């Protein structure tokens, strides 16, 4: 349920993030405040493109920090059709207008990422995928709280949040660890027993070892498609308690020749590296 | 000279900013550390797509928090060809590998952004316009300084960096001020004599009012461009001293139409809010 | 309009500044509280020095943390006439007392910035000069939003609040890129068409070497007025789109000295470094 | 001894300080940087008033920040003859122009108030006083440290840092509570053993009834000289453990007056308000090119 | 009066403190949220131990930060008698529960180092003792507020709160400037008239100098209470302006023996660094 | 290894924390300096009472800051046995003596619980326990990270570190979701894939439920040890799977009665909130 994904966010750290998105915007003196005058006004919020709305309660704590309202004619997650009244804020007017970049901008990048996360979704659901849709770790840094969110509203997984979510051996750290089986069983002592540990493969062969070494996730990374389904079939037969992600030169179009029953797990970094934001405006009336 | 660029970063908010960055990806125990272990490694930097090199000083930065060097193969600036070996990073692994995300995630978007920026630069050469390709105020919040940056490396103009560098007159400030001749007085006489006016026009007749006001520059927004030129030569005749930018609906594909001998400025919000990120790697060797 | 320029201030960095203002204040423990107790109290702000009254949005910002309201009897800008009864605060007792020291000191410096402004555009238009009387860069670390109020309060212009509000090439740029001409040029390639770049000159020669690289303005640093508007008059003839800008040594005694009909603005280091606060206390006159 | 003053700040919150005002001061790009370069280059700091010099851990601090050395050719707390060179700074050009606007503001306002506060220590000296100067808590809020820190250089006393330096009894205080003897009373009970209670007086009768309750000093505030002395004589005589402080429309010009035998502390609230900064500059003398 | 203590915590320092409290504990996605949702609901928060209750300015910015209101049923300062029902904190059941672990963390260490104080305080005042029980320096870093205030709800001293409250010369001091007269000395100088100078002594002797110097406190550290009341008698005879502290191995147990009429302050480094946290629950009823 | 338990601070953290424990210390003028003065200096650590040693990285941190060095005589995690020398710390005397309270404080608290964590680990190994002792969440706010090191150094496990380790299910959240079947539908659904889920049960009706919804651990809080291993050996029958962790009432004494073959953790309230700090003195000399 969409809507009620907004109790996710702790609201204390909400507010410290978007003081700073404020304080970044206007350090200083804002001239432009005599323009507009500081009596009470109203504007409408327009979705200008197709895609899902997400990011309401950030677009709030910005106006709620500059004392104005919002009321949203679309709940959070809604499919957008553009040209859309989506939304009404109301306050001061150099108040409303000292927020309107952030907020915008905000509600674009969020909603992006939840377009592009619904697409992959439906794709996958297309084919008749049951998995779980994810995104990577590959988010703008100051702003993951954002975009996992967003792709949390399009219906996709956030994945690791960070480096503590859970203990992820990539193939640096099996370098560094001298081989899969060292890294693995180093992982697997170090972490909590509160913890996963997931390992980051490019063979069938690391795959089997990381599995035997006790990885609770098995990340097939840059498989071709015809390579992936028998490495995790096989994985699957092996070790059934063992859950299989896919990742690697993933898109939306070729994303239903990844999907296969043996996949629990298709990560994509285009749903945050590529995901264009959506076109929004703020029309005082 | 987009090597002496780097320059423009004061080294005080830098680090506080790439400080930022690191508690945000590791708040508590990196359980991971124990895998890779304190041994001395080295990497590599591998550039697997095309398009502008940009990022360095805050890849710079995060490495030398995290007490690693990086030396860099390429200049700032430099055409990427991959698959390319663009830098090498050296230090304890543990650390290297606690750098590689944000680093990468950082270096990713700040070179999508230049390369973007460099690729509507030549679309604007080739067209032989001598004018400004510039972003716009569409940005990341948080992240605006890496990505202002980048335009920098691209080629672009940065445009105002915040509210503060200088006073714009939207179409919102012109409907809470009652009219394009208030709020261009109200803007005038409240910007310092240090600052300059600018003032968002969607017709002639506003763009002629505004110039009238004593605007410095004038905005002429979402105009097609056959419609574009004829006001702009029309406004370059009667107020030579003033500066015209064209923005909205502006694509690298049309930029051409868009540029004209009266056009001082193009400012695409594509380039922040579409660039796609590159694809860069950190190998461990 | 004096008034209407509380709107200037962005809300969320005066709650940070303000913040920080009482953390200073009061680190730990606030034993004095038990002295005064939490009942509701009132206090009188009385003025008692003559000059413009600046720093309400402060003032206020600063008991609003508190939970105290204030109300004012004059308006922003208003003419000091001491021993005058400015404004009432209301709140619990001890939060009153937290909030005395700060909020006065504030009030006490903004409104002595204002008032020496104040002081220097009256002398300026009494030369019948028509253009901006201004401050400097030369501000408190820290407490420059303060400051720049305040001069905007008694009626002169803030210049750049910062180095990114336009690029000033400084004697020192001028040495490091070896002459005005090169200095000027790469100012102007760097500033963004965004900025204007202005040039601090102490001659004549320095003067059309800049305006003639691009310079939208020009800094006459240090001259003697008898040089100065021989100066400032040949500029403007050869170049009319470029403001010319006096500094150096000015007083509000020898301004009128400095006034001429082709110098644009005047920036006077001493409406900040040497503008004497205000007196300014805040009597407690109630309980319950 | 001045020079050993330096002692006193803590080099974490010295860190912190300087950090805000340089991003305060350049939040975004600094096109200016592109016009010279980073190339090594050295400038000369002059005093041009005259004063006493203060400031030169901040300044440091400042450009240290900013990968820039400095040499002091004065030590902390010398005379200042104008016009005279008082150090040198080394650095990457840009780095040290970015720098160079904070640092002499701090530096003018340091070495303004320690300026006033070694005029008015003179002044007592003169009059043959051998009791404390000192400041008021009437500071610039954000910029205390500097400011109590140049009042050390100039030879006079910080006084309370904060409210929780010592706990003082104000007018207002007396007013909330109801009277000076419930105030101080309150105050003392409050107030840990660890610290002192000061009470503010406009009257020999508050003062009594001060030093009565156990106050540990009493701030004889707004006298005229001339009602001072008397009262502070009389003070001193019942209560000889009670120190005295006299403050209130003190000027360098009347101070003399209101020196005396009982007088413990005088403390000037112009020392910090009405310090004009002293006139610096920081002229860059060479360049070099890069490498 | 400990239900007025309350004013001693400056409202902003207290905001942010809490805020930072709040970040630590929940610094990404509240998953767990989805299972409460945001229905109003009221908890009830219950004493499990005796001890002294002390906090509340605490636990309520704890929950006004998260939009909810808490109602005490027990002032500042009571006595626990488990289980004892102390408050009703009532909001959205998410933020309530979100929180719960903060909260219960901050009231049971300042109860738990409030209930030690108030031990020893009642320990002191059953030996005849007019004297101040006090704390330490020995505070958890981050965390001085809560456990200053603790101390102060028990009846305990807070000491110098921090390193400006007072000039304290340790017996570190006292080897870096090579003596006591030249660190009391120095000590006296430095510190403005505003602030006294404490001298940390293990010997008469240093104690004397310390009184000679200059010294407004001397602290005695790590006697034995056979040799330290002789001490004090004498240092209190010669030099009766001069206060007494006693400090160093002092327990619940042996505190009457270190009172004396001629030690004016104990302080306790266990009062803070031994005192166990008090059990708390806050159990959802709605 | 407790000598490599230092990498998992991420040294950006520590940085941060340490800097906010200084200025909580002395805000403003340190007038004690001028007794002190600035000439090099060495003092030495002093152990005086028993116990195991942990917070070396923090104690570093805290010099580093102040411009001190330090060398140890002992490793991290050494069995300390008064009257020990345990370091050396080198710096200007004034740097040192502002460095002492906070460093000692930390040292102090973080060993008192590695010191308790370490007695609990030797009791339940004595009863021949193969399972992991853990730490609970309560912990002192602010000052989690030097307590979950403390606990690490011990050899105790830290648990989960924030909410975000893991999603678990206290008998409020059961409560307010009305049930625990609903309660861990609704955990388990909504914690990602990548987290486990544990449920906070009073009976063996609950910790069935729990299991039977797919709970990953079940923590039996507040059982009595005759009715707790008849429990726990039959939810390890009907899942093993689940892993079973107890808590309540659980002291150092009465530690053994609670190991038994099927409880795999067991966390103890009193290793962060009960356990006395160590004494140890900074000696200049």
Same mark, same amino acid.
């Given at each position: ?18 003081? *700073?998105?404020?304080?970044?915007? $206007? ?6 405040? +005599? ?6 006004? /109203? ?12 990011? /309401? ?7 709620? /920090? ?72 590959? =988010? ?25 979510? +859970? ?37 069938? #062969?690391?795959?089997? /070892? ?20 028998? =490495? ?5 037969? #092996?070790?059934? *308690? ?14 239903? #020749?990844? $999907? ?26």
């Amino acid at each position: 349920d969409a809507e009620g994904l907004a109790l996710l966010l702790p609201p204390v750290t909400l507010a410290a993030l978007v003081d *700073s998105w404020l304080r970044e915007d $206007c350090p200083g003196l804002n001239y432009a405040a +005599l323009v507009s005058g500081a009596g009470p006004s /109203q504007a409408a919020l327009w979705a200008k493109s197709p895609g899902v709305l997400a990011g /309401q309660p950030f677009f709030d704590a910005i106006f709620t /920090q500059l004392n104005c309202q919002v009321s949203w004619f679309l709940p959070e997650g809604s499919k957008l059709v553009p040209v859309a009244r989506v939304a009404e804020v109301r306050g001061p007017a150099h108040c409303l207008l000292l927020g309107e970049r952030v907020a915008l901008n905000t509600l674009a990048r969020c909603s992006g990422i939840a377009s592009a996360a619904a697409a992959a979704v439906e794709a996958a659901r297309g084919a008749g995928w049951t998995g779980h849709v994810a995104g990577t770790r590959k =988010t703008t840094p100051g702003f993951r709280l954002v975009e996992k969110y967003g792709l949390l509203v399009g219906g996709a997984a956030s994945h690791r949040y960070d480096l503590g979510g +859970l203990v992820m051996v990539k193939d640096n750290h099996v370098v560094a660890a001298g081989g899969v089986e060292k890294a693995v069983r180093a992982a697997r002592q170090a972490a909590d027993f509160t913890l996963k540990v997931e390992v980051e493969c490019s063979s069938l #062969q690391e795959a089997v /070892q990381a599995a035997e070494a006790g990885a609770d996730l098995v990340l097939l990374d840059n498989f071709k498609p015809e390579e992936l389904h028998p =490495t995790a079939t096989v994985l699957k037969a #092996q070790f059934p *308690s063992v859950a299989v992600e896919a990742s690697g030169g993933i898109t939306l179009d070729n994303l239903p #020749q990844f $999907c296969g029953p043996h996949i629990d797990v298709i990560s994509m970094g285009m749903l945050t590296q590529a995901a264009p934001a959506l076109d929004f405006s703020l029309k005082l009336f």
